[PDB]
Design a binder for this molecule. Structure first.
Ligand SMILES: CCCCCCCCCCCCCCCCCC(=O)OC[C@H](COP(=O)([O-])OCC(O)COP(=O)([O-])OC[C@@H](COC(=O)CCCCCCCCCCCCCCCCC)OC(=O)CCCCCCCCCCCCCCCCC)OC(=O)CCCCCCCCCCCCCCCCC
Ligand SMILES: CCCCCCCCCCCCCCCCCC(=O)OC[C@H](COP(=O)([O-])OCC(O)COP(=O)([O-])OC[C@@H](COC(=O)CCCCCCCCCCCCCCCCC)OC(=O)CCCCCCCCCCCCCCCCC)OC(=O)CCCCCCCCCCCCCCCCC
Ligand SMILES: CCCCCCCCCCCCCCCCCC(=O)O[C@@H](COC(=O)CCCCCCCCCCCCCCC)COP(=O)(O)OCC[N+](C)(C)C
Ligand SMILES: CCCCCCCCCCCCCCCCCCCC(=O)O[C@H](COC(=O)CCCCCCCCCCCCCC)COP(=O)(O)OCCN
Ligand SMILES: CCCCCCCCCCCCCCCCCCCC(=O)O[C@H](COC(=O)CCCCCCCCCCCCCC)COP(=O)(O)OCCN
Ligand SMILES: CCCCCCCCCCCCCCCCCCCC(=O)O[C@H](COC(=O)CCCCCCCCCCCCCC)COP(=O)(O)OCCN
Ligand SMILES: CCCCCCCCCCCCCCCCCCCC(=O)O[C@H](COC(=O)CCCCCCCCCCCCCC)COP(=O)(O)OCCN
Ligand SMILES: CCCCCCCCCCCCCCCCCCCC(=O)O[C@H](COC(=O)CCCCCCCCCCCCCC)COP(=O)(O)OCCN
Lengths: 438, 155, 58, 97, 111, 77, 82, 205, 127, 147
């Protein structure tokens, strides 16, 4: 734990002292060192400590950090996926912004103080405004959307944290507190409602992903959406369980509506990135509902599905980025003959799309099975609703694949050595998780 | 049942003593307790030490239940595979025990919103028995099937 | 009475009007394309059809 | 159009390729090209067959260790020659063999 | 008219002054279409042609509100059935007006 | 720059001209028709919901009738 | 050339509409003096007002927001006529 | 719980109750109780009386808006040039009409609120929603298409917002103290106060 | 020749595109097709939906006539000239348990009423 | 048509590269391609991750990484006790009558008899007996069946 936190603080620090020409090499080595430190944290985490594997405090309640099941999986996912983002990004400015965003996100996951959690997650607010609104390839609209949505949700969460700190006297997760207040529950909930895109607060995500760089999109879908599940498991369910049980019919309505409307909206998309973004929104609904059931099957299923998404969505966003670099287009209508012209890109694309559809040899299948079982534990109709509407994902994915698969094309647009190197870890991880090493 | 503040503070002091006794000798199995800390608190959250210890005991128990269920399933599958076509008569008991284990594991910590897992349709069969008894004694006509001897391989 | 309602830009009329002339994709030509909406018709037992199809010795 | 310099490195059209059919020879596919027939195929196929037999041996070992027969066969089964965990056959009447 | 930009040996240099066009990553870009580009622009900027008409209100209310109402009604029914199944007293839900305070079942208690 | 908008007429003799165009107006179903088909198809999709509602109603009605009769028998006696 | 948003209206008509804002501009001191004076007297009077229900207060705030006219709106439409 | 095996949160016994214990030995309250005026105005028993008590607020807001607009018109008019028309004749309709419309809308809102509460017999959110909806319907009598839907919604929402954050919020969070021991958890060993903190004297302005 | 056959290339778009052009599937070969055949454009055989419905209306009664008789008009006693297969008591009791069994229709049995109520079982799980 | 020399088992007719893998052109003299800057770092870091994950999953003692592995021996012991106890329960009809009484007070059906036997050492039963919710008869019944 201490090694992981130290490496996390060293990665932004290293950039200040690098030669400005060695920046990319140093950043890659630091990312790998952070991954190795995360593996060490996993090694030093004994299952015998059932509640929290490790807790460290550095002199205050704010500096209380600790790892649990959700935290451990998300932290390992962030450390696994960061090297890919690093190699995909060029320039000191871009590296600095990305490394600061990563440090803030990775510190947020392990934080056990609500106020510290807020301080670390929302520090990366201007950096995303600047990243999504970059000079030539960025959109100011998307930056404004994401920034305003984040500020409003996090401010509500902050108000709830202030009330809990005033009333109980502490806001640390390790101190058992329960609250029946509905205003405070709503304040904590609104952050989760926005961060994990749920209809009608999902509009910020697609704009940000489309106008973000591939490293940014990969980080966003891979781990930024997951930060909601850490807040739910660590900062919402322990204190506001009563309000989740009181509002379960409403929670279920909003989650199922998000899943349905997002699936239908994905059908009208002509941009590959927008298709992947709306697929993520649809997938987040099952995770949110499963965790809200407050059952063992649901919490485990939600975390597992989150890992599966955090392994499948970065792959699709990476392949889309590679294709866009080769062709300078994201319109499905312009891209044809990709099967014949890019047999190697096509194979990986088909594999990842099969993963997104929750086929058996993919992590998504196991995760979905567990989440559906949790819903069936609640009610049979709850499970049936989700299972039936899954066909809509098939229709859009099939239509996209069919449009891309065949036609006439005069351009050989296949992946280079660098592109295969970038996806190989993701492919291997997907396969390993698919075979049951979740 | 009412709890006076004097009794609550007394229990708090006793809990602190229990923590101090646990702290005196190192234990690698501290978070895998074999016995719960008995209490009459309205809310377990009041005493944090009791809450965490009892939660760890509950997790230990549930893990044990899950492994027991897996063992029961293995004996049922072996029994079914050995007997052949006599499986229905000879494997009724093993199946009954396996289904009981499944119910215990699932029902103990189902959650606030989860329904009871009716492995073996025992609850449905019971409900149908009550409905039949009432209809017959009151002279009503039951619109539901009568209770069944066996509804599953075991229960 | 002047009110916000007067100066709010209500979405009552389209800001952008789609171009009237629109692309129709090329399609193979079917010479006769009138849809048959009547399951039972005199056309099926027409005298012409009987002479052309039913009657000739095969 | 004057073929590019790299075209010397690329392979020719195979015997099975129809003469009219034109394909780009630069494209790489893991499953092979349009008509394949590489030189050295006979050796590659022999290596493949050897890897197949070795994997079959490993699979056979694994299966034999994990094949659990809990009910006696009605008559003699081929598994007896290779696996020793077969219960002694009992016939329909019930007589042991 | 074309030349190989990439050098495997590592002695890659961009001949910015070469008469012949380098076969760089830009060689494989797909040619855009004036009409397709305008279609893409129209599709993305479809908020401009949005108009509040009775048909639009009808369609929105009937499908979006209608689905939301159906989903709420189903969830409420399932909650009522589960409460009856579990044997728990009628739970105090948010919009339900119940003169009962029951919300979370007691784990110690036997229902 | 942009792709050529000029078509190829090499195969026009072999495979036919492109003069014939589609007759579709590229517009979707009417709002009135859509309301009927959504409110018809969606109930068909939710067949389990109606089965559960039916059985639950039957069970509750039977239970209430049983209670009523029980009360009646427990009053006189 | 790139696809661009269609601008409703003719160029000269829109420019003419924009030119109706080019009118003699009063100094803001005149408005401020009155607002300061009446605001001071209003604050003194507010202490004596009866306590109103929160619902009534919110409704009054809504009505005031709806009935407030922006200074630019009067400026554009002002005509020195009967 | 922070584990994947058991449900998070906890359960509290419904049978077992904890006897209330005073926050402090002596309680000094710096918060004054509602005035007799507040209760009189809040009384909705007689709709006409309720309406006439609460309209002064709407009339004042209408007068402020009309004075604002009238001043804006007056400021632009030139003193140096003689004007044929009478300025007061031009300006008086502005103020009068604004005040009348504001008073009418507030009267509709107060009347409908009181009448619904009397007929229903219960204080509820619906009374505010129906009063707002009726006011918004009167506001949008001749307005184009979107406004008839939007104004009844905005107006109905406003009493909902007022009820949630003006009445329900404070009563819901009355118990929380912030000093001594947490409201629910008095067993915990936290410093116990003899007297409550008095951060300010009761106001008098 | 399976491979290398001539194809006609679809003409490049030269007019403003309709908003719902995503309903057309064009790979670059000349005959493009709707996303779902028959959604618009030429219909196979020149047969409208109304024609198909009228056909199904003519056909449905003739097809349903055999099934309606036995299922509804006929009864267990009159459906067949024999009783269901007779089994020893131990076998019969077990076989009667199966809801989807064939021994539940034995009117001769004194447990017919119970068996018939078992066959018409619960629509959904009670718990 | 047919095979190239009329024999299926003849050398392939294609000499050269079927395609260019990754788009790289073979060096004329057979010079190896220069390795990319990231290849060594990428291979070391990711291989180290996967190898560490493998070693942790398999090398670690039972109950360190997978908690269920620790519970397996204990479950076997409780299974043995439960099996013996259930066998005793089936034989003695006096105990069955007492449990039928205990079950009713606990709002449990008769079929849940085996379930009660299997929850002898669980939060609900242990704390209910202490508090008074569970009838004290259960303790004696459990002792009669060797706990
Ligand atoms: C003891 C033994 C020695 C061992 C060493 C141990 C010492 C420990 C620490 C010492 C390390 C040196 C500290 C660095 C100081 C200068 C850093 C800097 O200028 O950043 C850019 C600078 C790059 O310089 P440059 O490329 O040459 O051009 C910059 C030009 O000057 C101007 O270029 P421009 O005009 O084009 O601006 C473009 C701008 C685009 O415009 C923007 O985006 C503006 C956005 C506003 C700020 C960003 C908001 C979000 C920032 C979040 C914080 C990041 C960490 C996240 C972790 C969460 C923490 C809660 O983009 C950027 O500048 C970079 C984007 C991301 C960097 C933002 C992070 C810097 C935050 C504040 C810097 C500190 C200045 C203090 C000033 C001191 C006296 C003046 O440095 C970096 O390499 C990246 C930032 C490194 C961050 C570490 C600094 C700590 C801040 C974290 C706060 C935690 C509290 C502090 C405690 C720290 C430990 C005790
Ligand atoms: C004879 C002298 C003439 C003066 C007459 C009286 C003299 C003053 C005597 C006493 C003055 C004290 C009290 C008067 C009000 C206090 C304001 C003040 O004095 O500041 C100095 C102010 C000038 O200061 P400035 O800094 O130079 O100008 C800044 C502006 O940018 C100015 O630039 P601008 O005008 O070009 O820009 C205006 C901008 C400025 O923005 C504001 O006005 C902000 C005010 C917002 C609310 C204010 C707080 C409300 C709390 C009231 C507290 C009491 C209730 C308690 C609980 C309520 C909870 C909220 O707002 C707008 O854009 C127009 C919209 C109007 C409000 C926007 C909110 C709309 C929400 C409604 C939703 C419905 C739409 C749905 C459909 C939409 C479709 C998507 O002088 C005045 O305006 C006084 C005129 C008196 C008319 C007020 C009308 C009603 C008064 C009470 C109602 C409370 C709401 C306030 C509404 C408007 C007030 C400005
Ligand atoms: C009543 C439903 C009862 C059973 C439902 C099962 C199937 C219902 C509809 C089947 C649609 C699946 C067919 C399909 O995917 O193929 C289309 C692809 O079409 C599409 O992708 C359009 C989307 C259709 C998929 C869903 C539409 C129907 C939804 C059912 C209800 C709508 C909403 C209800 C709840 C959401 C290709 O069209 P063809 O031209 O016929 O291809 C055949 C090949 N050949 C050229 C040789 C003729
Ligand atoms: C007691 C109080 C009673 C109630 C009174 C309410 C009165 C108003 C309350 C509204 C507060 C919401 C604040 C957001 C305002 C909408 C955003 C401003 C619109 C806008 O044009 O922003 C542009 C881009 O924003 C964007 O692109 C953002 C798009 C829209 C953001 C969505 C809002 C976040 C989600 C909303 C609610 C979520 C949960 C709510 C609990 C930037 O404009 P510019 O820089 O060019 O400036 C030039 C001047 N025109
Ligand atoms: C219309 C559908 C509702 C949309 C929400 C759908 C799903 C959201 C569920 C979130 C889960 C936990 C949140 C707890 C309650 C939030 C909404 C529950 C529904 C609700 O509004 O119930 C109200 C009570 O809640 C309250 O009193 C609080 C309402 C929320 C306050 C709104 C903004 C608060 C922001 C505060 C920021 C932080 C403050 C911290 C001090 C009134 O229901 P009722 O019980 O009176 O029944 C009387 C009816 N006959
Ligand atoms: C302006 C915005 C809105 C304007 C337009 C709204 C128009 C929509 C109105 C109808 C929408 C669907 C109907 C659902 C509500 C019907 C009436 C609600 C009252 C109600 O709860 O009755 C229950 C309806 O059955 C049920 O439990 C639900 C049956 C219908 C659900 C399945 C139908 C479609 C399935 C598609 C999937 C959606 C659900 C997926 C899980 C059965 O009465 P009760 O026994 O519960 O007694 C409870 C005491 N009233
Ligand atoms: C920020 C809250 C503002 C509401 C936003 C809703 C959307 C705005 C559209 C305007 C519509 C006007 C406002 C209606 C919202 C109230 C919900 C209607 C439910 C309802 O009618 O039940 C009432 C109680 O609900 C209630 O009145 C309490 C429910 C609290 C409202 C919902 C709280 C969470 C909503 C936040 C969602 C997302 C935030 C972004 C805006 C009746 O109750 P009763 O006691 O009268 O029983 C009857 C005995 N006569
Ligand atoms: C020879 C070299 C072989 C080359 C390729 C093989 C690569 C490894 C092959 C086997 C190693 C499997 C480990 C992968 C993850 C398994 C994690 C795991 O299941 O154990 C969990 C540890 O808790 C934790 O919290 C673990 C957190 C860390 C797990 C990784 C998180 C995702 C990181 C990126 C995904 C890549 C994964 C590879 C607890 O398991 P349990 O308590 O649920 O019970 C187990 C039944 N389900």
């Amino acid at each position: 734990m201490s090694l992981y936190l130290f490496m996390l603080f060293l990665q932004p620090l290293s950039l200040s002292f690098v030669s400005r020409s060695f920046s990319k090499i140093s950043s890659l080595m630091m990312s790998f060192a952070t991954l190795w430190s995360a593996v060490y944290m996993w090694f030093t985490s004994n299952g015998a400590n059932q509640t929290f594997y490790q807790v460290v405090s550095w002199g205050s309640d704010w500096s209380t950090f600790g790892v649990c099941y959700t935290s451990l999986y998300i932290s390992l996912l962030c450390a696994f996926i960061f090297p890919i983002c690093v190699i995909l990004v060029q320039g000191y400015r871009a590296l600095s912004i990305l490394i600061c965003i990563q440090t803030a996100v990775s510190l947020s996951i392990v934080s056990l103080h609500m106020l510290a959690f807020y301080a670390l997650f929302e520090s990366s607010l201007l950096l995303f405004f600047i990243l999504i609104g970059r000079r030539k390839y960025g959109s100011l609209s998307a930056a404004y959307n994401i920034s305003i949505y984040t500020f409003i949700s996090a401010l509500g969460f902050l108000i709830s944290a202030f009330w809990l700190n005033w009333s109980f006297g502490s806001v640390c997760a390790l101190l058992p507190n329960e609250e029946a207040n509905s205003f405070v529950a709503f304040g904590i909930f609104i952050l989760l409602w926005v961060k994990a895109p749920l209809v009608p607060f999902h509009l910020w995500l697609p704009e940000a992903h489309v106008y973000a760089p591939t490293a940014g999109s990969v980080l966003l879908a891979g781990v930024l959406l997951k930060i909601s599940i850490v807040g739910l498991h660590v900062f919402f369910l322990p204190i506001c369980a009563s309000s989740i049980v009181k509002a379960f019919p409403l929670i279920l309505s909003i989650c199922l509506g998000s899943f349905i409307f997002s699936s239908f909206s994905t059908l009208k998309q002509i941009d590959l990135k927008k298709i992947v973004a709306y697929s993520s929104i649809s997938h987040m609904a099952i995770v949110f509902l499963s965790s809200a059931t407050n059952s063992g099957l649901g919490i485990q299923g939600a975390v597992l599905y989150c890992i599966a998404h955090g392994l499948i969505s970065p792959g699709l966003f990476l392949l889309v980025g590679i294709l866009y670099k080769n062709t300078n287009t994201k319109l499905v209508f312009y891209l044809r003959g990709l099967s014949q012209q890019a047999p190697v890109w096509w194979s990986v694309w088909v594999f990842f799309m099969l993963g997104n559809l929750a086929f058996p040899l993919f992590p998504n299948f196991i995760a979905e099975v567990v989440c559906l079982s949790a819903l069936f534990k609640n009610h049979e109709l709850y499970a049936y609703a989700f299972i039936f509407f899954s066909f809509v994902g098939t229709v859009y994915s099939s239509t996209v694949l069919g449009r891309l698969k065949g036609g006439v094309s005069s351009q050989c647009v296949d992946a280079s050595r660098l592109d295969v190197i970038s996806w190989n870890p993701l492919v291997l991880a997907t396969v390993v998780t698919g075979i049951g090493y979740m | 049942t009412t709890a006076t503040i004097e009794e609550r503070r007394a229990f708090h002091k006793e809990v602190l003593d229990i923590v101090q006794s646990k702290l005196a000798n190192k234990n690698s199995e501290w978070a895998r307790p074999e016995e719960p800390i008995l209490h009459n608190l309205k809310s377990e959250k009041e005493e944090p030490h009791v809450y965490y210890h009892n939660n760890n005991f509950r997790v230990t128990r549930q893990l044990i239940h899950f492994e027991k269920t897996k063992i029961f399933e293995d004996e049922l599958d072996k029994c079914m595979r050995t007997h052949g076509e006599a499986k229905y008569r000879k494997c009724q008991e093993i199946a009954k025990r396996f289904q009981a284990s499944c119910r215990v594991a699932s029902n103990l910590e189902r959650g606030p919103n989860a329904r009871k897992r009716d492995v073996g349709f025992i609850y449905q069969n019971n409900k149908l028995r009550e409905l039949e008894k009432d209809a017959k004694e009151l002279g009503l006509n039951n619109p539901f099937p009568p209770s069944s001897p066996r509804t599953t391989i075991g229960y | 009475v002047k009110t916000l309602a007067d100066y709010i830009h209500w979405r009552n009329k389209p800001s952008s009007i789609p171009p009237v002339d629109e692309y129709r994709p090329p399609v193979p030509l079917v010479n006769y394309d009138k849809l048959s909406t009547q399951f039972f018709s005199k056309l099926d037992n027409d005298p012409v059809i009987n002479r052309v199809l039913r009657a000739p010795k095969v | 159009v004057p073929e590019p310099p790299y075209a010397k490195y690329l392979a020719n059209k195979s015997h099975y390729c129809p003469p009219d059919f034109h394909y780009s020879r630069e494209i790489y596919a893991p499953y092979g090209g349009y008509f394949n027939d590489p030189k050295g195929w006979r050796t590659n196929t022999a290596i493949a067959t050897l890897v197949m037999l070795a994997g079959a041996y490993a699979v056979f070992c694994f299966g034999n260790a994990r094949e659990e027969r809990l009910r006696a066969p009605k008559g003699w089964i081929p598994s007896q020659l290779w696996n020793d965990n077969v219960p002694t056959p009992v016939d329909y009447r019930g007589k042991v063999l | 008219s074309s030349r190989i930009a990439g050098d495997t040996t590592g002695k890659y240099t961009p001949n910015i002054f070469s008469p012949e066009t380098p076969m760089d990553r830009s060689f494989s870009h797909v040619p855009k279409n004036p009409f397709w580009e305008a279609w893409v622009f129209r599709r993305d900027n479809i908020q401009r042609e949005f108009v509040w008409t009775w048909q639009t209100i009808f369609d929105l209310a009937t499908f979006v509100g209608g689905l939301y109402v159906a989903m709420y009604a189903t969830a409420s029914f399932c909650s009522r059935q589960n409460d009856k199944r579990n044997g728990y007293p009628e739970r105090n839900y948010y919009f339900s007006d119940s003169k009962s305070n029951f919300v979370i079942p007691d784990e110690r208690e036997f229902y | 720059n942009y792709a050529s908008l000029k078509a190829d007429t090499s195969m026009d003799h072999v495979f036919g001209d492109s003069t014939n165009k589609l007759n579709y107006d590229f517009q979707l179903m009417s709002s009135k028709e859509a309301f009927f088909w959504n409110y018809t198809l969606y109930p068909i999709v939710g067949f389990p919901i109606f089965l559960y509602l039916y059985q639950f109603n039957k069970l509750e009605n039977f239970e209430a009738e049983i209670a009523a009769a029980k009360a009646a028998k427990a009053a006189s006696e | 050339d790139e696809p661009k948003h269609q601008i409703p209206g003719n160029a000269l008509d829109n420019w003419a509409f924009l030119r109706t804002y080019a009118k003699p501009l009063p100094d803001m001191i005149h408005y401020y003096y009155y607002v300061y004076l009446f605001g001071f007297f209003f604050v003194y009077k507010v202490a004596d007002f009866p306590e109103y229900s929160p619902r009534v207060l919110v409704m009054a705030a809504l009505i005031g927001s709806l009935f407030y006219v922006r200074r630019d709106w009067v400026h554009r439409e002002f005509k020195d006529s009967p | 719980t922070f584990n994947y095996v058991i449900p998070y949160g906890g359960s509290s016994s419904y049978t077992i109750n904890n006897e209330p214990v005073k926050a402090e030995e002596v309680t000094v309250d710096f918060s004054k109780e509602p005035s007799a005026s507040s209760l009189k105005l809040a009384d909705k028993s007689d709709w006409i009386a309720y309406t006439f008590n609460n309209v002064p607020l709407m009339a004042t807001v209408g007068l402020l808006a009309g004075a604002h607009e009238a001043f804006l018109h007056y400021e632009r008019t030139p003193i140096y040039g003689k004007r044929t028309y009478n300025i007061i004749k031009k300006l008086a309709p502005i103020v009068i009409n604004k005040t009348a419309y504001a008073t009418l809308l507030g009267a509709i809102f107060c009347a409908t609120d009181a009448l619904y509460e009397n007929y229903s017999g219960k204080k509820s959110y619906t009374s505010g929603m129906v009063a707002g909806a009726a006011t918004g319907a009167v506001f949008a009598i001749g307005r184009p298409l979107p406004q008839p839907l939007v104004w009844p919604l905005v107006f109905a929402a406003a009493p909902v917002i007022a009820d949630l954050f003006g009445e329900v919020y404070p009563e819901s969070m009355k118990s929380a103290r912030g000093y001594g021991t947490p409201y629910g958890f008095e067993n915990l060993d936290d410093a116990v106060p003899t007297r409550n903190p008095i951060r300010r004297n009761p106001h008098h302005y | 020749a399976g491979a290398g056959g001539p194809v006609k290339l679809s003409p490049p778009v030269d007019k403003p595109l309709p908003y719902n052009y995503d309903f057309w599937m064009d790979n670059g070969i000349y005959p493009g097709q709707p996303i779902y055949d028959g959604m618009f454009g030429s219909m196979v055989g020149n047969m409208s939906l109304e024609y198909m419905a009228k056909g199904w209306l003519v056909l449905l009664p003739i097809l349903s006539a055999p099934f309606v008789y036995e299922h509804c008009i006929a009864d267990d006693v009159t459906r067949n000239p024999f009783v269901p297969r007779q089994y020893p008591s131990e076998v019969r009791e077990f076989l009667a348990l199966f809801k989807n069994g064939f021994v539940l229709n034995d009117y001769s049995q004194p447990d017919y009423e119970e068996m018939k109520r078992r066959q018409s079982g619960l629509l959904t799980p009670i718990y | 048509s047919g095979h190239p020399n009329g024999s299926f088992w003849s050398e392939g007719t294609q000499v050269g590269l079927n395609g260019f893998k990754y788009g790289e052109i073979p060096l004329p003299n057979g010079q190896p391609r220069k390795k990319l800057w990231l290849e060594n770092i990428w291979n070391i870091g990711y291989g180290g991750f996967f190898l560490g994950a493998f070693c942790l999953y398999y090398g670690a003692p039972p109950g360190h990484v997978i908690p269920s592995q620790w519970a397996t021996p204990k479950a076997k012991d409780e299974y043995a006790v439960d099996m013996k106890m259930i066998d005793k329960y089936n034989e003695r009809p006096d105990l069955q009558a007492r449990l039928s009484i205990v079950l009713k007070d606990l709002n449990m059906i008769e079929e849940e008899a085996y379930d009660l036997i299997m929850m002898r050492k669980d939060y609900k039963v242990l704390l209910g007996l202490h508090s008074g919710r569970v009838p004290a008869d259960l303790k004696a019944i459990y002792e009669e069946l060797e706990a």
